[PDB]
Coordinates of C-alpha atoms in Angstrom, one line a residue:
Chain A
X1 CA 40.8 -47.0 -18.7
X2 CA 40.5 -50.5 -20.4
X3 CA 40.8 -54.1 -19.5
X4 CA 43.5 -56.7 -19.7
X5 CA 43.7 -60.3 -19.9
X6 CA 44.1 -63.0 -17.0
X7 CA 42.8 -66.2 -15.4
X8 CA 40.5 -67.6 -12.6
X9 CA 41.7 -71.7 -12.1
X10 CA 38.2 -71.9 -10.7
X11 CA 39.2 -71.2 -6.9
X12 CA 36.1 -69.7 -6.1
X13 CA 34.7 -73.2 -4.8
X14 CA 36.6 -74.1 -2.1
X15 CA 34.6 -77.9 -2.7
X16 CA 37.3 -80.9 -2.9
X17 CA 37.3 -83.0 -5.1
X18 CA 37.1 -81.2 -8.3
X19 CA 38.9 -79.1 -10.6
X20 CA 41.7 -81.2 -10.0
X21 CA 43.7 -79.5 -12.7
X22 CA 45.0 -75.8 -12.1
X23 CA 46.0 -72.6 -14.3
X24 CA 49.0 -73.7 -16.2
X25 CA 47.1 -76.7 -18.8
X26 CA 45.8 -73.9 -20.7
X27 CA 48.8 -71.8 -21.5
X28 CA 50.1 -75.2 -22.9
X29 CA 46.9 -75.3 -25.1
X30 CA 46.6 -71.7 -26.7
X31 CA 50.9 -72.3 -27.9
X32 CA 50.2 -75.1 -30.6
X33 CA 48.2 -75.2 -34.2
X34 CA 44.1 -75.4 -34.3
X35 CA 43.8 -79.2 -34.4
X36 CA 41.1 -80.4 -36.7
X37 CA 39.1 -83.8 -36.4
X38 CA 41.8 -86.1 -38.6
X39 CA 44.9 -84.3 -37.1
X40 CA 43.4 -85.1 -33.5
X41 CA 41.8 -88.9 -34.8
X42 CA 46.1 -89.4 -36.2
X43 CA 47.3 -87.9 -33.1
X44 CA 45.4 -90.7 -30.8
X45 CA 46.7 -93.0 -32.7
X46 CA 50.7 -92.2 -32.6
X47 CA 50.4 -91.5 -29.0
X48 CA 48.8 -94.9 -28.5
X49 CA 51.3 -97.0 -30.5
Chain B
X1 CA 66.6 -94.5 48.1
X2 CA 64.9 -91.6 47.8
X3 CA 62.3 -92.7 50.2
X4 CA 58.9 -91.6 49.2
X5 CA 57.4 -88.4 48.8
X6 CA 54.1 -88.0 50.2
X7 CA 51.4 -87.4 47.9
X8 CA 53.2 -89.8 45.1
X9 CA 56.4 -90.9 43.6
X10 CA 54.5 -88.8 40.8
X11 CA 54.7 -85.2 42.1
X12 CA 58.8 -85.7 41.7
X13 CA 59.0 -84.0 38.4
X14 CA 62.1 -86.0 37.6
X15 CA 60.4 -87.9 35.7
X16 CA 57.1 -87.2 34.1
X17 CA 55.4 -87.8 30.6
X18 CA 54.9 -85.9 28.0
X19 CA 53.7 -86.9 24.2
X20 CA 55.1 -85.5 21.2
X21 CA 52.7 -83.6 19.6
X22 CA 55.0 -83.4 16.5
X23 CA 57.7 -80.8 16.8
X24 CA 56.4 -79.3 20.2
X25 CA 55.8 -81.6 23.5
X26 CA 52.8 -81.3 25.4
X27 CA 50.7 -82.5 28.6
X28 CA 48.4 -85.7 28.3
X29 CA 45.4 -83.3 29.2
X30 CA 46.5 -81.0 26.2
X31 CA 46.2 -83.7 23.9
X32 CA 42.9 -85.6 24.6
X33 CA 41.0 -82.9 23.6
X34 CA 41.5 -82.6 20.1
X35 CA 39.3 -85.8 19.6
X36 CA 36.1 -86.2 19.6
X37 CA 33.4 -88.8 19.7
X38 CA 30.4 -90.2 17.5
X39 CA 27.7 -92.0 19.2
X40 CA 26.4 -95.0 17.3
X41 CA 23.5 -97.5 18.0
X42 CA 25.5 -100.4 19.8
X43 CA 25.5 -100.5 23.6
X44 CA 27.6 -102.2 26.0
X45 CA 27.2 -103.2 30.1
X46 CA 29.6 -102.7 33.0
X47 CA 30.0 -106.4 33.4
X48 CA 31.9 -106.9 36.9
X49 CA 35.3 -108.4 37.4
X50 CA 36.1 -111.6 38.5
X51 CA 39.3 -111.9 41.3
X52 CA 42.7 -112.6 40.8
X53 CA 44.1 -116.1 41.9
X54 CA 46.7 -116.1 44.2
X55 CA 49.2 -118.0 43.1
X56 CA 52.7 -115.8 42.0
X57 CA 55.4 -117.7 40.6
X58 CA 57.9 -119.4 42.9
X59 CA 61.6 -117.5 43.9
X60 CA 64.7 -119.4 41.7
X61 CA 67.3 -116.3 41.2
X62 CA 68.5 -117.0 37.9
X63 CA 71.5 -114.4 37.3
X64 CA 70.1 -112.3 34.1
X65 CA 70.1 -108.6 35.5
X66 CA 66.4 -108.6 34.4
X67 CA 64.7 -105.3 32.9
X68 CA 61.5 -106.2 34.2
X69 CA 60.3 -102.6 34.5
X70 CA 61.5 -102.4 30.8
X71 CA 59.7 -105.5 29.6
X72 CA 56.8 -104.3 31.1
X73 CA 56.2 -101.4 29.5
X74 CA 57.1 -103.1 26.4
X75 CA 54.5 -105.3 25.7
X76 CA 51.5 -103.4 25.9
X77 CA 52.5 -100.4 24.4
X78 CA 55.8 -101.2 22.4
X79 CA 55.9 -101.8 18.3
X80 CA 55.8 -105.7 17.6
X81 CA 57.4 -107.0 20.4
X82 CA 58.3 -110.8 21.0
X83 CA 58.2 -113.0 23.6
X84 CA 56.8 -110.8 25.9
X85 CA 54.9 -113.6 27.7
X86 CA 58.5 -115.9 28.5
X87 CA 58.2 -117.3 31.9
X88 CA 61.8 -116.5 33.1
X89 CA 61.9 -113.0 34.0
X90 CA 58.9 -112.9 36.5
X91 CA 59.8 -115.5 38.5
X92 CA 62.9 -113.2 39.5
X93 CA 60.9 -110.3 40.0
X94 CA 58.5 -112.4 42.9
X95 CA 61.5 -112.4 44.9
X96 CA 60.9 -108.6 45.6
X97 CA 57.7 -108.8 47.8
X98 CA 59.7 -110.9 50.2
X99 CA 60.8 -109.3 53.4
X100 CA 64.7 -109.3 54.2
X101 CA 66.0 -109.8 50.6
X102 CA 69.0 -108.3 49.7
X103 CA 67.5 -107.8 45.6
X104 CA 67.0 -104.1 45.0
X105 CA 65.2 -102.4 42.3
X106 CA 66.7 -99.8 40.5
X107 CA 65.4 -96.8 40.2
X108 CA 66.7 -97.0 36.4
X109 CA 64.2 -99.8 36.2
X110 CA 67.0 -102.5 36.6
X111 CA 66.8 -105.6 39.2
X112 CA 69.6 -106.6 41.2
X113 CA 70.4 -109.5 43.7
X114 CA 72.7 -107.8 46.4
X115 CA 73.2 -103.8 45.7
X116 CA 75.4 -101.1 44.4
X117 CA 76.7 -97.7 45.6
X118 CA 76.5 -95.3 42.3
X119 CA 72.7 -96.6 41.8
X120 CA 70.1 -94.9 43.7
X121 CA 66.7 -97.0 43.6
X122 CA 63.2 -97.2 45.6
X123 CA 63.0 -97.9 49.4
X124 CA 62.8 -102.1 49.9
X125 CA 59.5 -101.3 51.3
X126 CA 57.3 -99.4 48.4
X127 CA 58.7 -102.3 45.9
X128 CA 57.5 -104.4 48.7
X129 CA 54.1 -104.1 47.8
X130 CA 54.5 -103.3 44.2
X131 CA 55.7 -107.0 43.4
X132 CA 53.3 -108.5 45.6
X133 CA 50.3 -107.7 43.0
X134 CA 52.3 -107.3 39.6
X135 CA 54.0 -110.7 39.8
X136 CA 50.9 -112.3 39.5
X137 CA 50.5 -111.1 35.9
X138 CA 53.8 -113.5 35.4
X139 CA 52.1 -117.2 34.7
X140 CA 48.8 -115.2 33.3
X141 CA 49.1 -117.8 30.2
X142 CA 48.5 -120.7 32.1
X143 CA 45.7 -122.5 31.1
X144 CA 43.9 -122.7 34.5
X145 CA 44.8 -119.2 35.9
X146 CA 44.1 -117.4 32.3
X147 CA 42.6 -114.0 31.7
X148 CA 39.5 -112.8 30.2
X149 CA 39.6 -110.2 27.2
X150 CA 36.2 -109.9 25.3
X151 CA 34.8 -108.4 28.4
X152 CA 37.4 -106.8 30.0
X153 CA 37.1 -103.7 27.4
X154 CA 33.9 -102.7 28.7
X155 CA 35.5 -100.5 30.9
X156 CA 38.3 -99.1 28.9
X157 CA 35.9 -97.5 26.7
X158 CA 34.4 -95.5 29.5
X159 CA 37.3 -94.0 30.6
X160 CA 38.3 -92.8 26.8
X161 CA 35.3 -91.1 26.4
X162 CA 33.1 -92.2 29.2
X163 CA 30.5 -88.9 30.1
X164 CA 30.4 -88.4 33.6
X165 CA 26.7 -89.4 33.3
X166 CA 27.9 -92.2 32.1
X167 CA 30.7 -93.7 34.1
X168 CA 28.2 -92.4 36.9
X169 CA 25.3 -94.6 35.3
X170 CA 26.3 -97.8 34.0
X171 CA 26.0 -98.6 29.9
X172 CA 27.6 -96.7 27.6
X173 CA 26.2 -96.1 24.0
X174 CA 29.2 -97.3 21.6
X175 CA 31.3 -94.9 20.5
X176 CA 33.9 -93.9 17.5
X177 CA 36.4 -91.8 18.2
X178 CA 38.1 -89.5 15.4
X179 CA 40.5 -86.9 15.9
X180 CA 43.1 -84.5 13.5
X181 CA 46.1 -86.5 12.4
X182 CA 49.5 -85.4 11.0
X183 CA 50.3 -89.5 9.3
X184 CA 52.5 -91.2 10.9
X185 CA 50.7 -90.0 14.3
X186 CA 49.3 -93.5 15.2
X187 CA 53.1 -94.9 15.3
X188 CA 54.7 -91.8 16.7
X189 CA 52.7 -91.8 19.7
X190 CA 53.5 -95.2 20.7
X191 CA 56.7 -94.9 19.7
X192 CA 56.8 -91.8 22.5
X193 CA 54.8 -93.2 25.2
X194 CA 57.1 -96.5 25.9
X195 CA 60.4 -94.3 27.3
X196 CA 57.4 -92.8 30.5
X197 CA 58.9 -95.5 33.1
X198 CA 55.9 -96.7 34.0
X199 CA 57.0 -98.5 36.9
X200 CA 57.1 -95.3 38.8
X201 CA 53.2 -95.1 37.9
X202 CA 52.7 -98.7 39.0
X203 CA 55.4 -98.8 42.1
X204 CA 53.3 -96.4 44.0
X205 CA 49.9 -97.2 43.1
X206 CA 50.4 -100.0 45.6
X207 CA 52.3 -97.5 48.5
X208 CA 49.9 -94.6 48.7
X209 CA 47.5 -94.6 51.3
X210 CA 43.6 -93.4 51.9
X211 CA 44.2 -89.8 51.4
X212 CA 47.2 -89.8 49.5
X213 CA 45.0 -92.0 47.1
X214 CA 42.2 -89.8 46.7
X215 CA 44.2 -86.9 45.8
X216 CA 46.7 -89.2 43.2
X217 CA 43.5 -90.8 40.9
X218 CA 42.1 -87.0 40.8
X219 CA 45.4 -86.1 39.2
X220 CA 47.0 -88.8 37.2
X221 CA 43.7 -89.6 35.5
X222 CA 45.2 -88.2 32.4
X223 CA 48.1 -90.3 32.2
X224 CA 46.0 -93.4 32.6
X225 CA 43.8 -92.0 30.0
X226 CA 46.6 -91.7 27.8
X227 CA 48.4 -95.7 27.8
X228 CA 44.6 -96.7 27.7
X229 CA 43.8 -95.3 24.2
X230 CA 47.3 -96.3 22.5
X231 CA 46.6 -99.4 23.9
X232 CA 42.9 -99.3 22.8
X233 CA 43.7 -98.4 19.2
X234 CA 45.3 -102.0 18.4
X235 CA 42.2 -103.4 19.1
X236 CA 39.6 -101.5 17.1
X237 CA 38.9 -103.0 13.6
X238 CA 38.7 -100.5 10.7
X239 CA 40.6 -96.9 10.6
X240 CA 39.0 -95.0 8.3
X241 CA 41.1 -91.7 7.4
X242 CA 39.0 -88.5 6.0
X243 CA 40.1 -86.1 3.7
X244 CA 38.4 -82.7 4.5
X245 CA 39.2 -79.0 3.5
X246 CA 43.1 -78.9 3.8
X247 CA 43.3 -81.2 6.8
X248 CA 43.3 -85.1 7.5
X249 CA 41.5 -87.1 9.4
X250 CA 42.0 -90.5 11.4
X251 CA 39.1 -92.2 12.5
X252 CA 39.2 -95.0 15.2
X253 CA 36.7 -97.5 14.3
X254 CA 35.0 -98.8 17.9
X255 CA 36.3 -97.6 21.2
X256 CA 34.3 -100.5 23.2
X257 CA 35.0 -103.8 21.5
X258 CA 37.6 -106.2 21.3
X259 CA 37.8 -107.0 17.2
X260 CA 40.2 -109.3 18.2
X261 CA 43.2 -108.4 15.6
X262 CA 44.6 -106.4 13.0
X263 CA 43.1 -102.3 13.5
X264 CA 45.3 -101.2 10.8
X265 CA 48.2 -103.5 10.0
X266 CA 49.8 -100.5 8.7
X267 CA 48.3 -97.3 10.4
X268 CA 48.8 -98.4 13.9
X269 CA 50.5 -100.9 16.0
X270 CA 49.2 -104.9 15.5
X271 CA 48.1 -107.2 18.9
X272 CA 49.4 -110.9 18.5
X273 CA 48.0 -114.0 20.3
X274 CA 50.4 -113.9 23.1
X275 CA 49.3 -110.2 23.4
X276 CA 45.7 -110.5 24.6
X277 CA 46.9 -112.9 26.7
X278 CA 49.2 -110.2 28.3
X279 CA 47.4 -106.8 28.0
X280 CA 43.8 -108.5 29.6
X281 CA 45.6 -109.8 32.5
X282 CA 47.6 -106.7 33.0
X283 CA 44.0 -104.2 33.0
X284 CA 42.7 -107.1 35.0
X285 CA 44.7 -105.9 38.0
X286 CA 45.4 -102.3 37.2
X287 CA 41.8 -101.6 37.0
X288 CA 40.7 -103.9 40.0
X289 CA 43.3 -102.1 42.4
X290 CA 42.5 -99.0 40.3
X291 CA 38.7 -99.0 41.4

């Protein structure tokens, strides 16, 4: 009876003050291309000028 | 007229006092409770109380109508008020103390000269002796007759969160008070409080007798509690909020001392120059009479 796939947005802390950022970040990561070092050095740079 | 009722103008239930604890009212000795208090290493002395001169402004019967009952509670407790320390409206008031005078108060907490028919107010003789001790506070600017204030607040400390083994001994270890807080709580009390018509608090603290006494302080000593800390929270210097679990925190900085301005121009409600002038020599008599 096999597994699945979720996520845990770190909520067993209960501590304030960190993991200020919740679930939803990394669904937004794992949609685009695998970014290598010149594609992420150009892509600091356009978003910057 | 209403004459009196015996055992306090208080036990009337017309008019009482309740804060807002946000959407749902409550009882003065509901809400002290959620505080609590954080001794530090500063001490201060019961330093006795010099007496009052007598010497109340002089009757002239200008025609204004005067709120003095509404000026009153005003100053101390009201949001930025101005002018609280004009000369004008007292005067008026000193007329009351005298007897055979046909100037009534309302029991609205409007003054008249003459009288009315539709307006019910408090027998001549309990205003009597109500305006023969609280129109003294009138010329309490005055150079020569002025107040005290750095030392006055040894004693409204005590009361706030004065032990009993400590209002029973004398010095009190400085404290810092710190209780839950939904914001805009520091405002939205003193907005609240100034509607209590606090005359009928003062107007019979003069009128009740050696029984009737000991039974009223026993009582009330919430609802003197409660104008005590509002006032006490423009005075403190630093309000320092906390931000714990889910909840929030407000922090009251020294019960005990006189900073002398500011607490939080923004989180609370500000003292000016002609304030200290006004709330010292208003505590100066409350608490004298009071004790």
């Amino acid at each position: 009876r096999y597994h699945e796939s979720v996520l845990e947005i770190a909520d067993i802390f209960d501590q304030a003050d960190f993991i200020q950022t919740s679930d939803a970040v990394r669904q937004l990561r794992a949609l685009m291309p695998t970014l290598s070092t010149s594609q992420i050095r150009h892509a600091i740079e356009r978003i910057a000028q | 007229m209403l004459q009196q009722p015996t055992g306090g103008y208080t036990t009337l239930e017309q008019f009482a006092f309740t804060i807002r604890n946000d959407g749902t009212n409550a009882t003065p000795t509901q809400f002290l409770q959620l505080l609590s208090y954080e001794a530090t290493e500063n001490e201060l002395v019961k330093k006795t109380i010099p007496t009052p001169e007598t010497h109340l402004p002089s009757a002239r019967n200008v025609p204004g109508n005067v709120y003095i009952e509404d000026a009153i509670t005003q100053a101390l407790f009201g949001i930025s008020a101005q002018n609280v320390n004009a000369h004008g409206y007292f005067s008026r008031l000193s007329a009351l103390a005298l007897p055979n005078t046909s100037a009534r108060l309302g029991l609205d907490g409007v003054i008249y000269n003459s009288e009315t028919i539709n307006i019910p107010f408090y027998d001549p003789a309990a205003v009597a002796n109500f305006a023969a001790t609280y129109a003294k506070l009138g010329n309490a600017s005055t150079p020569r007759y002025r107040a005290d204030m750095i030392d006055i607040y040894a004693h409204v400390g005590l009361e706030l969160a004065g032990t009993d083994a400590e209002r029973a001994a004398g010095v009190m270890p400085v404290k810092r008070a710190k209780f839950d807080s939904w914001e805009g709580s520091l405002i939205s009390l003193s907005r609240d409080v100034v509607n209590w018509k606090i005359l009928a608090f003062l107007i019979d603290l003069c009128s009740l007798e050696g029984e009737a006494l000991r039974a009223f302080k026993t009582r009330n000593r919430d609802v003197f509690r409660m104008m005590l800390f509002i006032m006490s929270t423009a005075v403190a210097a630093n309000v320092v909020n906390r931000k714990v679990t889910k909840r929030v925190d407000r922090v009251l900085e020294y019960i005990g001392v006189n900073s002398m301005r500011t607490a939080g121009r923004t989180a609370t409600i500000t003292y000016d120059l002609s304030r200290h002038e006004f709330a010292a020599k208003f505590l100066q008599l409350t608490f004298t009479r009071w004790n």
